[PDB]
Amino acid sequence: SFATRTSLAADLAALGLAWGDAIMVHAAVSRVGRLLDGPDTIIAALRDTVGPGGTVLAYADWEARYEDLVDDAGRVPPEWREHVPPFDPQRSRAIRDNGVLPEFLRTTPGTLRSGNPGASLVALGAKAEWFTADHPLDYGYGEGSPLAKLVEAGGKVLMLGAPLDTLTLLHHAEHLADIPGKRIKRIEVPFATPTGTQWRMIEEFDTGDPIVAGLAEDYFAGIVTEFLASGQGRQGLIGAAPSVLVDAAAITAFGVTWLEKRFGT
């Protein structure tokens, strides 16, 4: 009748989560069942399973409701500029679109938050420094990004009952894919500085839709499904939530190959 940090940690180990791992989690908290400590049960269970040498990560993004106001160049009209709350990595909230866990992780003491607002990750544990450091402001899903560092460190991604098309790391595969017609997003972003608000234009491949035309909006889920069908990754219950645990490097390489086989040369 109550899942605990102990029972979830047992389920996470059974799924394959290992001591010392860097684990990025996408959680559908309601699907886990009744939790004794609410969403913090999940965070605590992940820390217990990877141990103090491990790191727990989540896709933070930022709640920035102002995008409904920008013009044709992605710039904020002058009458609205000073009313837009600037981005502060330590104070700006994580987005709500994909659940409350990223914000809960962000407000856990010790958690660090990377500097690219729309692509920001939160990290808590031994490698939090490094995972959140020097997030490039342009093409924040590409080289030198926290997602790239997750691949480089041999990290893992856990879909904890979350829809499989919300696996943020596959946007890093989209960035790396050598294919034509990649869609681009440009938008002005306000940053909080010790001297005041500083505006900057951000450019990246658009992650609000598939990177190229001819793909269903939810096509990431099919890539993960084919990934599991090929004998890679693990499936199992975390609490009451059907969950998927995949290797970050392997799913990235699989995603890049998937796109280059259908749209490259």
Added chain:
Amino acid sequence: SFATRTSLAADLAALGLAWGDAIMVHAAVSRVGRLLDGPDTIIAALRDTVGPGGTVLAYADWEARYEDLVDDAGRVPPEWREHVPPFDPQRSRAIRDNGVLPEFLRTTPGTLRSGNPGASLVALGAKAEWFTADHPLDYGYGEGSPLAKLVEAGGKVLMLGAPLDTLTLLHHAEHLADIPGKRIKRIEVPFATPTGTQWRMIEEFDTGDPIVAGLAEDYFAGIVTEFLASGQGRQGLIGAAPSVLVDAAAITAFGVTWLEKRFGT
């Protein structure tokens, strides 16, 4: 089309919130309208209106799902004791039942959280230290409590679209009322200490139901309505939210008189 930190602060001033006030807030965030910065717009507007000499407060309580497991004496069964997350004033989440604003305020840098878990308040501003110090663990809605200090400080309570029966300060009027048949609650509470988890029995007047039998659950709303009908307190719009602003000392005395005239002598 967008309520801002500037517009909300103007609405608060028009309603009567003043420079230097100590203001306790109960908010229905969705009723305020379209917010550029989400719930933090409300918090910022409140701080702008009262200034650095004022204090912004909210009823935190704490997330304690283990109460479903206690026996008739309020004690946690031994098989569950080790698994119940202990209370940490700086890390335990605010209860989510009455909206997210208390939790957002709790995670605002500088905010302090008082030590009585079930009765805890968060406070942010000049008098945060004083409001949250030495919260008595027994009868935490009574003498020496943060609610008592709000009356002592000449504070105010703002119902920002929130249902009028959620005005926590009226539990302090319940505590002060010289009436017979007051219901009492006893429950075991785990505290986080530098020594480990320390369990303590907490006793208070029951705030989960009216202080005496024969009262509608929502009778607090009738008291507030009568208070306004008598010509006290102010009503007005904060954004799109119908709001009520009352003097903390005046509504407490009014509530005590209301109870002592219908019960007791």
